[PDB]
Coordinates of C-alpha atoms in Angstrom, one line a residue:
Chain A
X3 CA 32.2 -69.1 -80.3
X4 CA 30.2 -68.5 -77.3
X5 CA 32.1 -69.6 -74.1
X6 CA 28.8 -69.8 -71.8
X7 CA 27.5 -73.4 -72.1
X8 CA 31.3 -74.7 -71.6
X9 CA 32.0 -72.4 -68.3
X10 CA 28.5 -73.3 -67.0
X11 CA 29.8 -76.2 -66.1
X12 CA 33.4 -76.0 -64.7
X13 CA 35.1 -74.7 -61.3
X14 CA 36.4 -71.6 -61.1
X15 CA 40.0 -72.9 -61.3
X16 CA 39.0 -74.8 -64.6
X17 CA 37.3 -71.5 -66.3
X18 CA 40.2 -69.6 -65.3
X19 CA 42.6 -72.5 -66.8
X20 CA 40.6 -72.5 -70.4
X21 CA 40.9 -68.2 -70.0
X22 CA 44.0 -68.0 -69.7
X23 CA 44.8 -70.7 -71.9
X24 CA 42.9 -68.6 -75.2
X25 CA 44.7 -65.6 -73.9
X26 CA 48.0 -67.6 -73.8
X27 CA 48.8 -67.2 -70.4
X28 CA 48.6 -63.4 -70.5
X29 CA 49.4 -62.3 -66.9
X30 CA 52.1 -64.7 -66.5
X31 CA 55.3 -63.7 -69.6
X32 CA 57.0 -60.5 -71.1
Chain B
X4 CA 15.1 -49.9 -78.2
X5 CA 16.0 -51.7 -74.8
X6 CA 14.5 -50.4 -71.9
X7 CA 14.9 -52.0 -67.8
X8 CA 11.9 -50.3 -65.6
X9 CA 12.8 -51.2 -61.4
X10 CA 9.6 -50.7 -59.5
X11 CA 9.0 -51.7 -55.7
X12 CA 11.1 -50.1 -53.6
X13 CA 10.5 -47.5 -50.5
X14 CA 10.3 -47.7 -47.1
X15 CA 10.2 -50.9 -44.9
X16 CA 11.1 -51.6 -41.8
X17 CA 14.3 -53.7 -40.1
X18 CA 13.5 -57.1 -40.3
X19 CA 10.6 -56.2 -43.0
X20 CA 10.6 -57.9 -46.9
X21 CA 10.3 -56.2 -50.1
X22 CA 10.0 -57.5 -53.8
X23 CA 11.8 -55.5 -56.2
X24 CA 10.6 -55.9 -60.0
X25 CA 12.8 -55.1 -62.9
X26 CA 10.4 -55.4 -66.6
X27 CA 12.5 -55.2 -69.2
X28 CA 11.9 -54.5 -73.1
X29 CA 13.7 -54.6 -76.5
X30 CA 16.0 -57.3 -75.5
X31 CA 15.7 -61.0 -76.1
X32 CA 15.1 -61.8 -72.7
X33 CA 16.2 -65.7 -72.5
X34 CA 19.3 -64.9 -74.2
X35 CA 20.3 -62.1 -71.3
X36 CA 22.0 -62.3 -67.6
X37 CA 19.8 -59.7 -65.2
X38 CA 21.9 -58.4 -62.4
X39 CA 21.1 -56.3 -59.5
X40 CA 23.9 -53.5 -57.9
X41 CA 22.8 -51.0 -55.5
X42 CA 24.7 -48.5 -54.5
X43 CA 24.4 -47.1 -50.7
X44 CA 23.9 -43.1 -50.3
X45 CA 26.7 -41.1 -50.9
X46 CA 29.2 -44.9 -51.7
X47 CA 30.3 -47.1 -54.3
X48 CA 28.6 -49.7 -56.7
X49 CA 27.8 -53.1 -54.7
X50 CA 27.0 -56.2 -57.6
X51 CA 24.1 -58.0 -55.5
X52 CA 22.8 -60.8 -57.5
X53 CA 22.6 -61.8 -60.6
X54 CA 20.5 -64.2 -62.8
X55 CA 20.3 -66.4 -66.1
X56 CA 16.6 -66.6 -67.2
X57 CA 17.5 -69.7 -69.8
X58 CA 19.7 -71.9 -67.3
X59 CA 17.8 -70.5 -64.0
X60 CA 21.2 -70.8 -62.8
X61 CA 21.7 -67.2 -59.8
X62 CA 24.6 -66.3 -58.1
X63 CA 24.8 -64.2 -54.6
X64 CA 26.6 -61.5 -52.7
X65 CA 27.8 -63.2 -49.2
X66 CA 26.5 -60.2 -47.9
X67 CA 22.7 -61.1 -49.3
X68 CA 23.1 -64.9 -49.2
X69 CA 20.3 -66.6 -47.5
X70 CA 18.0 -63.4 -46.8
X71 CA 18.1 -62.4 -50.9
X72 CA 16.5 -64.3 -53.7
X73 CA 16.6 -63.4 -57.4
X74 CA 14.2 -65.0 -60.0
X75 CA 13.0 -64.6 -63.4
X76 CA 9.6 -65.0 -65.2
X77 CA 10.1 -65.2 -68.7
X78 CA 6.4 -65.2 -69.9
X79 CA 6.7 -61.2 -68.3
X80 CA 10.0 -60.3 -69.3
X81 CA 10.5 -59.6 -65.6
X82 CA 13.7 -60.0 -63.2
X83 CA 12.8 -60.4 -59.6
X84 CA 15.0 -59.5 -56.3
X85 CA 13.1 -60.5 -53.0
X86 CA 14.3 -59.1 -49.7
X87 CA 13.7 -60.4 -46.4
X88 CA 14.9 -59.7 -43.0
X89 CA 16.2 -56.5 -44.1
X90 CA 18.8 -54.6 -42.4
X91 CA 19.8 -50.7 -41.9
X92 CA 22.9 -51.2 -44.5
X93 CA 20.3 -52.7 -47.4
X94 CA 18.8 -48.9 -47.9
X95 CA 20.4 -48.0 -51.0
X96 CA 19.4 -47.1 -54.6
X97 CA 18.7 -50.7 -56.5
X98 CA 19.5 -50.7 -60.3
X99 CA 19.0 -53.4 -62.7
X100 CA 21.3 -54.1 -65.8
X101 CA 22.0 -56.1 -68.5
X102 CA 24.4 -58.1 -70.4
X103 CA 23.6 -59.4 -73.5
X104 CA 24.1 -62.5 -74.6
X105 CA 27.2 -64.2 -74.6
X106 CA 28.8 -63.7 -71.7
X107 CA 31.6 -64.4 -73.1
X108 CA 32.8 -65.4 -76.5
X109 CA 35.9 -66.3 -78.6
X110 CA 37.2 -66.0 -81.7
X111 CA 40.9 -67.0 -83.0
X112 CA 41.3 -63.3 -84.9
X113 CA 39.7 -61.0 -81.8
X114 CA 40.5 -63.1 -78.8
X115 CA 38.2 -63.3 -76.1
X116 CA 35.0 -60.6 -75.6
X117 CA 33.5 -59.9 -72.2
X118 CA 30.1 -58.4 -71.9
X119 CA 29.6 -55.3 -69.9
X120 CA 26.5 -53.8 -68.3
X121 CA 25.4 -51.1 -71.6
X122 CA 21.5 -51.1 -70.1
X123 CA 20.7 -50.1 -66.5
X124 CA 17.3 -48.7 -65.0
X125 CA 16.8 -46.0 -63.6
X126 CA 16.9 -47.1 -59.8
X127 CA 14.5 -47.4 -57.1
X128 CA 15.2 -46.7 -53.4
X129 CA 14.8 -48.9 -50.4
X130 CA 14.6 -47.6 -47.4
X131 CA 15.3 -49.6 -44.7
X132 CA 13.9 -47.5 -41.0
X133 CA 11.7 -47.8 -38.1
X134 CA 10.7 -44.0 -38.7
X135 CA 7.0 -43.4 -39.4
X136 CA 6.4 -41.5 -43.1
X137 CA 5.9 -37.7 -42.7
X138 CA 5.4 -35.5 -45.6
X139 CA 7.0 -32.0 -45.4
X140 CA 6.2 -28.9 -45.2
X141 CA 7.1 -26.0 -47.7
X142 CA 7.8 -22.1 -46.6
X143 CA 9.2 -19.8 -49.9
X144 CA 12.6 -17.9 -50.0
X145 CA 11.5 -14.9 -51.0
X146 CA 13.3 -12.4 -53.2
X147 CA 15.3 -9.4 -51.2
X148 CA 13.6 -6.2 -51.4
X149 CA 17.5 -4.6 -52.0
X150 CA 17.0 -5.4 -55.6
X151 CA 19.8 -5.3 -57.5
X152 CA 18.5 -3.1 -59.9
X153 CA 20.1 -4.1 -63.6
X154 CA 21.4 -7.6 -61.7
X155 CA 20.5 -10.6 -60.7
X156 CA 18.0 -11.2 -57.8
X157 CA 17.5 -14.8 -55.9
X158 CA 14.2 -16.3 -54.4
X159 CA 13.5 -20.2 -53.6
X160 CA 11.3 -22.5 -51.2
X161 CA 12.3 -24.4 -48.1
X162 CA 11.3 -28.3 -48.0
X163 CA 11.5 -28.5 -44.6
X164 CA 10.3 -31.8 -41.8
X165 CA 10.0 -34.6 -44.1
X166 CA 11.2 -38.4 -44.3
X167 CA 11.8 -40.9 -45.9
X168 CA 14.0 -39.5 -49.0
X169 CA 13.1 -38.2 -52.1
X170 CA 11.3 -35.2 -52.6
X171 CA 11.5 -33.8 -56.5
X172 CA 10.9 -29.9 -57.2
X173 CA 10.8 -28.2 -60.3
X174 CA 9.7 -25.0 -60.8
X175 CA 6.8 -23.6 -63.2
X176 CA 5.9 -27.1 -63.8
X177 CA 9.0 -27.8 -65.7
X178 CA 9.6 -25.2 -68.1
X179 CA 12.3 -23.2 -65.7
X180 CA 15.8 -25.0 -65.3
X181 CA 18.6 -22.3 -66.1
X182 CA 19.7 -21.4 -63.1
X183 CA 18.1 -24.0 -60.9
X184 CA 19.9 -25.3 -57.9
X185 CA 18.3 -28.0 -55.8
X186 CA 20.6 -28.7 -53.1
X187 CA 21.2 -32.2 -51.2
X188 CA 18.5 -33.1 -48.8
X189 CA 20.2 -32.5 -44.9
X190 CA 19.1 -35.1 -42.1
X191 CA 18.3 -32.7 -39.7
X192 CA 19.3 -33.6 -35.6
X193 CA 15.2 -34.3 -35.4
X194 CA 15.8 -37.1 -37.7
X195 CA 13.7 -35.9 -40.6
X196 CA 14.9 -34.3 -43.8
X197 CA 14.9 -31.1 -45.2
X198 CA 16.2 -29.6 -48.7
X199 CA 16.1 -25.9 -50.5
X200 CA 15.8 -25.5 -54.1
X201 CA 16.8 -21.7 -55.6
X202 CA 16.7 -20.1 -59.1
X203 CA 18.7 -17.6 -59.4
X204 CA 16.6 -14.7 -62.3
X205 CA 16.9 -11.0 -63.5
X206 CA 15.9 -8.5 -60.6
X207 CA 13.6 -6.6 -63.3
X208 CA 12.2 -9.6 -63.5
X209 CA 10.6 -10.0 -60.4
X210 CA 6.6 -8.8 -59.4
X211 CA 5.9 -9.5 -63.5
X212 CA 7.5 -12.9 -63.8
X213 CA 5.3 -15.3 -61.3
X214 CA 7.8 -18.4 -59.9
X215 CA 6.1 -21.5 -58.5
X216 CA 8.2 -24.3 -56.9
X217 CA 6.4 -27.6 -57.2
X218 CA 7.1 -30.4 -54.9
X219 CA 6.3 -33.7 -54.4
X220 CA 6.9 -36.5 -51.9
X221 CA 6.0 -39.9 -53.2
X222 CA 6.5 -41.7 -50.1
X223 CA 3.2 -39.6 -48.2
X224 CA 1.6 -38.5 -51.8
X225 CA 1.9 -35.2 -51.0
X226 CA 2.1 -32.4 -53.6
X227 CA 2.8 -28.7 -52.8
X228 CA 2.4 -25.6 -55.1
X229 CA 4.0 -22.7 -53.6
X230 CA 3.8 -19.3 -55.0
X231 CA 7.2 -17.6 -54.0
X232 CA 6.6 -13.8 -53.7
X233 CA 8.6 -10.2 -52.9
X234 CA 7.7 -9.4 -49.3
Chain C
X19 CA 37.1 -63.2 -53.6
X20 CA 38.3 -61.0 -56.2
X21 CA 39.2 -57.1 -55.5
X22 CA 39.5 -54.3 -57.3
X23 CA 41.8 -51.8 -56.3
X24 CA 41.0 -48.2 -58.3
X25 CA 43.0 -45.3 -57.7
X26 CA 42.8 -42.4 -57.2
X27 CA 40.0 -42.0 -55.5
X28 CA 40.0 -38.3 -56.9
X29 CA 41.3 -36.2 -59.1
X30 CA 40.7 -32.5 -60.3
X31 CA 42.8 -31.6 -63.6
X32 CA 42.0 -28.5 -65.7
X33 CA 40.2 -28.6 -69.5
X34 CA 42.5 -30.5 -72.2
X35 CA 44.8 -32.8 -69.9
X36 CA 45.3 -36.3 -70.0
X37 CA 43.5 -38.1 -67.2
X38 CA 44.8 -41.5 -65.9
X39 CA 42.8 -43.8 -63.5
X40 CA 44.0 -47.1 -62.7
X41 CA 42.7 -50.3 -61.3
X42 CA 44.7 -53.4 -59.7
X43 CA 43.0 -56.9 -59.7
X44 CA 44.2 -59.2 -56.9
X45 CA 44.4 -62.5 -59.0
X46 CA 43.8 -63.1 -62.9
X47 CA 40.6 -61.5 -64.2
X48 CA 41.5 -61.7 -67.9
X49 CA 40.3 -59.0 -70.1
X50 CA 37.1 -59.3 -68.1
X51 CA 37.0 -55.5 -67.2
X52 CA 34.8 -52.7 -67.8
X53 CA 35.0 -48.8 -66.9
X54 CA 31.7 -47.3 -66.1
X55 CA 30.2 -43.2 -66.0
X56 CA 28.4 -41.9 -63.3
X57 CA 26.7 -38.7 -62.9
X58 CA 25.5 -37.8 -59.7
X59 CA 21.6 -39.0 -59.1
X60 CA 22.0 -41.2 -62.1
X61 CA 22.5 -44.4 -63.4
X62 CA 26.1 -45.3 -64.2
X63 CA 26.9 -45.3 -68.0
X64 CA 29.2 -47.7 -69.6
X65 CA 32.5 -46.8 -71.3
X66 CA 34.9 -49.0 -72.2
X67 CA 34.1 -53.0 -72.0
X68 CA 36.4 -56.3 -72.3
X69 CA 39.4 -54.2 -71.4
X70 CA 39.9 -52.0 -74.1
X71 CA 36.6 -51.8 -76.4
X72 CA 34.9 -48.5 -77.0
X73 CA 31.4 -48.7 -76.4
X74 CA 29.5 -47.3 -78.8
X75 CA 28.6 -43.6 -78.8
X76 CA 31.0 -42.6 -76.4
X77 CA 34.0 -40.1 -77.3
X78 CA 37.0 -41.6 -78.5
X79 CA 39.0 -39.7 -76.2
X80 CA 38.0 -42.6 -73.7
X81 CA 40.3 -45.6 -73.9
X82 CA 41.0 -48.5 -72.3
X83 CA 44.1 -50.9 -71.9
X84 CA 45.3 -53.9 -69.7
X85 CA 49.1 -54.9 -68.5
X86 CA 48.7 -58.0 -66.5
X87 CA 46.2 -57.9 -63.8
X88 CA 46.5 -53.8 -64.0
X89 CA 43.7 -52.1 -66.2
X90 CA 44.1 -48.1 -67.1
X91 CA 41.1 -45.6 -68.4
X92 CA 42.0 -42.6 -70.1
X93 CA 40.3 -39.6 -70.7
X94 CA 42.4 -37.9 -73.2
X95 CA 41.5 -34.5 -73.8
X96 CA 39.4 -33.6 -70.3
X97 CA 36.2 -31.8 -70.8
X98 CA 33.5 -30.3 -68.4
X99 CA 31.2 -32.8 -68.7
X100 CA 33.3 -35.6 -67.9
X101 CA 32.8 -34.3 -64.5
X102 CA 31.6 -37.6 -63.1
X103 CA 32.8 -40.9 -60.6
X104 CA 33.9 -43.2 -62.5
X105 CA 34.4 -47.2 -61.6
X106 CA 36.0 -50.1 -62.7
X107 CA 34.3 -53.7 -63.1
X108 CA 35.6 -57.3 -63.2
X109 CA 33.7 -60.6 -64.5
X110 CA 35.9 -63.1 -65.4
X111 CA 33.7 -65.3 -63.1
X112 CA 31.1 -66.4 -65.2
X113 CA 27.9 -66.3 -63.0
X114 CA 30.0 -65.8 -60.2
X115 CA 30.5 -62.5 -58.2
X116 CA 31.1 -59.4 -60.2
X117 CA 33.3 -56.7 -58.0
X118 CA 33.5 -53.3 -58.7
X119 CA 36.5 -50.6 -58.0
X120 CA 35.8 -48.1 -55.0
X121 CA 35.2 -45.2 -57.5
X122 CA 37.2 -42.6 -59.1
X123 CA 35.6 -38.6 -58.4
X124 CA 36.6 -36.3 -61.1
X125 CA 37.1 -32.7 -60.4
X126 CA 37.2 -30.2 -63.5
X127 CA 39.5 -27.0 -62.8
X128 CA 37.9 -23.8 -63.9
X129 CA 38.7 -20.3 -63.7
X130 CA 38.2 -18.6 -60.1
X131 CA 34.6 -17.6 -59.7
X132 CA 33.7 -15.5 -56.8
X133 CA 30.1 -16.6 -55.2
X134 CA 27.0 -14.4 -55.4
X135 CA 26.0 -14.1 -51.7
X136 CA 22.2 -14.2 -50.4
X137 CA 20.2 -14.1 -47.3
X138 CA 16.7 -15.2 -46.5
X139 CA 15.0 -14.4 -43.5
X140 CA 12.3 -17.0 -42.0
X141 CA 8.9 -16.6 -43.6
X142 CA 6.0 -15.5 -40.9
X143 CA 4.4 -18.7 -42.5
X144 CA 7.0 -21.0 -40.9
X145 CA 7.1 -18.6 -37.4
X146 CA 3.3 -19.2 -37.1
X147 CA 4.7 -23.5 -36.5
X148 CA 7.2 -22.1 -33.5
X149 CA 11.2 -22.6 -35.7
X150 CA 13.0 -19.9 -38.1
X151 CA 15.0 -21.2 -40.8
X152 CA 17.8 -18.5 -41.6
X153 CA 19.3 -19.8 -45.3
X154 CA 22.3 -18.5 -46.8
X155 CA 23.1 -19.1 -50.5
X156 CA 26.3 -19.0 -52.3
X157 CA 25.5 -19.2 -56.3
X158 CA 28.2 -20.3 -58.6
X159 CA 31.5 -20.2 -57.7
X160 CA 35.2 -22.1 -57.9
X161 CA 37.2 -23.8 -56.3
X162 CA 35.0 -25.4 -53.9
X163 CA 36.6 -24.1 -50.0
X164 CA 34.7 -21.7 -48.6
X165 CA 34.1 -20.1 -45.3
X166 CA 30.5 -19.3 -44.2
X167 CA 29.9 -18.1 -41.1
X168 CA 26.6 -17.0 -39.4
X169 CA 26.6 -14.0 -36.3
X170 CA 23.6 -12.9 -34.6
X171 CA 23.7 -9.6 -32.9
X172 CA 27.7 -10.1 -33.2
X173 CA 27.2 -13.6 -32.5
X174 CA 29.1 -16.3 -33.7
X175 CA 26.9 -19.1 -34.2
X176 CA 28.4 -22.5 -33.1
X177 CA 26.5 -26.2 -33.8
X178 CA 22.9 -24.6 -35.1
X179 CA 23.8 -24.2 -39.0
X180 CA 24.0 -27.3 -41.8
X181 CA 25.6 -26.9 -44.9
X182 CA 24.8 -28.3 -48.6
X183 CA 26.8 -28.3 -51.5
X184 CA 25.8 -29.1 -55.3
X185 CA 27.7 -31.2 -57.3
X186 CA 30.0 -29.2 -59.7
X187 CA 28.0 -28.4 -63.1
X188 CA 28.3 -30.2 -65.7
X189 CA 28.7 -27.3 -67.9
X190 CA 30.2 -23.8 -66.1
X191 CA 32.1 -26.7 -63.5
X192 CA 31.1 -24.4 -60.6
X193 CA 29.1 -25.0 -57.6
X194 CA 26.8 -23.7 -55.2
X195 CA 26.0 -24.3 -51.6
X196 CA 23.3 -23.7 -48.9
X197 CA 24.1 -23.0 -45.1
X198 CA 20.8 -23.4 -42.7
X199 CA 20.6 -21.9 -39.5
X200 CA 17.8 -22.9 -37.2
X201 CA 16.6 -21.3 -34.0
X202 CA 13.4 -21.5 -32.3
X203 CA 10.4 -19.1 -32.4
X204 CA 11.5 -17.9 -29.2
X205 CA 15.5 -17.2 -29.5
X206 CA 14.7 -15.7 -33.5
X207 CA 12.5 -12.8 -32.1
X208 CA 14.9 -12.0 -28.9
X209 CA 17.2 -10.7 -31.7
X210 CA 17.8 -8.0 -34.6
X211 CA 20.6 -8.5 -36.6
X212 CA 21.2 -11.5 -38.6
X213 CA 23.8 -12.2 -40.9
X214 CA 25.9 -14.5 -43.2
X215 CA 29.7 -14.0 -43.8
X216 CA 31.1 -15.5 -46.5
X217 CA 35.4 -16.4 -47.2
X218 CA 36.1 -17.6 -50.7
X219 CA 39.5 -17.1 -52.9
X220 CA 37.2 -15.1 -55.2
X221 CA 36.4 -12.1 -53.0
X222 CA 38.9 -9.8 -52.1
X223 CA 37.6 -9.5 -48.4
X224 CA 35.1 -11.3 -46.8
X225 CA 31.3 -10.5 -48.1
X226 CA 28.5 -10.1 -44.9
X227 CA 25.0 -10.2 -46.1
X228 CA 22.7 -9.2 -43.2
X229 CA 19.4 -8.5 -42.5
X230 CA 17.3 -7.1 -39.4
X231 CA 14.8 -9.3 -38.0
X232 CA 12.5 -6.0 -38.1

């Protein structure tokens, strides 16, 4: 799924909330 | 294939505007991002602006907001930069590039997939001086009568006096590159520039084998042919 | 805003080694990274893209990979023409700003290569508009220090000569440079002997090309 259309419309600390929630939280664990 | 063609650029003066153009090909335009990055002489990569052509929506380097203004017309398949009140530290190369459509995407088995910039033109230079246009003048390096006989002998031309940047040379129209240097154009204390390009050929070569240096500078459409001789 | 931090900013490493250059974000930037190519007087190239994707038609001994907020390129089995500068790219902003690394310049070791010396004298072309142009050439050589100095009539010459260097070639990973002394009309006929002296690893003693201005 394309991500565009959804992240046109957020803040930056609500795109970087829905990243890192598909990535599960990446930079913060083991 | 996909192609991005910049066209625009040159010389202009501090506190001068410019409209950079950026046509692009063999791409579905409306389903693109257009960007502009410029990179100043001799430093890094500087993202400028970008653009989407289907949601209008642009985005701006603080250091171009306000004086900078990208736009799109997608009945020309053309990206836009406009440039006013133009400053010293604007004169840089100016590429456009690409990403395809999506920006980003997702998918449970691959995670998430960021686009990159895979097309860029070729560039286009801006200039950005109060010094007038003056093209140069060309003088040849001629070979050294103390041929080494069964080596290698050296002959060239001097592009001396000119501004603004670039001057091109080939030599013999094209058809001699082995052995070609073209050096770095030198801002001379007189504020002009000035560059030497030498090929390097067999010494029995020379007083059969004729080398011409062609030059041009765009900026004051000048072309020289210059005939580089023993003696 | 978002930085990139690359390092190092250069590097020379000899044919076959394993080549590491690294980038720091200073917050979050996902996978949102891409490694980029470029030769000089050209348009960058991409790489790698989304942290870790091969773009196609470029070597596989390019690769990418992420830890955290730290993003790596390797070059795997260094060749001649990866002479290059090579930069690192975040967009995790979507159309927001896009930051780039300060740049990575790549030096490829080569054998020692001594430089062919030559010296032009002004032509009487360029007299006839009142300056001389005095060019010395060093053709082809490695590493890239060198030593060129210019006498005239024993001389030294101090604050009259500029220097150009090529970028190392892309396929013999040498260069070549250009060192321009400029007098007037006037001073270039007072005197007879001219001449370039050139210090390079290559030569076993310094090498004076000379010529008189008769």
């Amino acid at each position: 799924m394309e991500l565009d259309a959804i992240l046109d419309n957020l803040s930056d600390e609500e795109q970087i909330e829905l990243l890192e929630l598909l990535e599960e939280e990446e930079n913060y664990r083991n | 294939e996909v192609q991005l063609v910049e066209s625009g650029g040159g010389l202009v003066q501090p506190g001068g505007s410019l409209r950079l153009s950026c046509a692009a090909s063999g791409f579905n335009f409306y389903s693109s991002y257009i960007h502009w990055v410029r990179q100043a002489p001799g430093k890094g990569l500087e993202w400028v602006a970008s653009i989407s052509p289907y949601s209008g929506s642009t985005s701006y380097a603080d250091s171009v907001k306000g004086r900078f203004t990208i736009s799109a017309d997608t009945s020309k398949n053309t990206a836009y930069l406009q440039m006013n009140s133009l400053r010293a530290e604007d004169t840089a190369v100016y590429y456009c590039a690409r990403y395809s459509w999506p920006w980003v995407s997702y998918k449970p088995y691959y995670g998430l997939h960021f686009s990159a910039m895979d097309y860029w033109g070729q560039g286009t230079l801006v200039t950005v001086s109060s010094a007038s246009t003056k093209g140069p003048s060309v003088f040849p390096l001629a070979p050294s009568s103390k041929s080494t006989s069964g080596g290698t002998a050296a002959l060239g031309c001097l592009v001396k006096d000119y501004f603004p940047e670039p001057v091109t040379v080939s030599w013999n129209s094209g058809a001699l590159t082995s052995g070609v240097h073209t050096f770095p154009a030198v801002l001379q204390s007189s504020g002009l520039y000035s560059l030497s390009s030498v090929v390097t050929v067999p010494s029995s070569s020379l007083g059969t084998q004729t080398y011409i240096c062609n030059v041009n500078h765009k900026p004051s459409n000048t072309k020289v042919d210059k005939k580089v001789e023993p003696k | 805003d978002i930085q990139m931090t690359q390092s190092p900013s250069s590097l020379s490493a000899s044919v076959g080694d394993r080549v590491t250059i690294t980038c720091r974000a200073s917050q979050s930037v996902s996978s949102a990274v891409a490694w980029y190519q470029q030769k000089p007087g050209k348009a960058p190239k991409l790489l790698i893209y989304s942290a870790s994707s091969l773009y196609s038609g470029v070597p596989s001994r390019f690769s990418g990979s992420r830890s955290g907020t730290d993003f790596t390129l390797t070059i795997s089995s260094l060749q001649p023409e990866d002479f290059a500068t090579y930069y690192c790219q975040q967009s995790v902003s979507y159309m927001g700003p896009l930051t780039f690394g300060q740049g990575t310049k790549v030096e490829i070791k080569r054998t020692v290569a001594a430089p062919s010396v030559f010296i032009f004298p002004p032509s009487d072309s360029q007299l006839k508009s009142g300056t001389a142009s005095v060019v010395c050439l060093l053709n082809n050589f490695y590493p890239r220090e060198a030593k060129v100095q210019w006498k005239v009539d024993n001389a030294l010459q101090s604050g009259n000569s500029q220097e150009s260097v090529t970028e190392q070639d892309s396929k013999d990973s040498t260069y070549s440079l250009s060192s321009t002394l400029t007098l007037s009309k006037a001073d270039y006929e007072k005197h007879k002997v001219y001449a370039c002296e050139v210090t390079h690893q290559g030569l076993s003693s310094p090498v004076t090309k000379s010529f008189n201005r008769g």
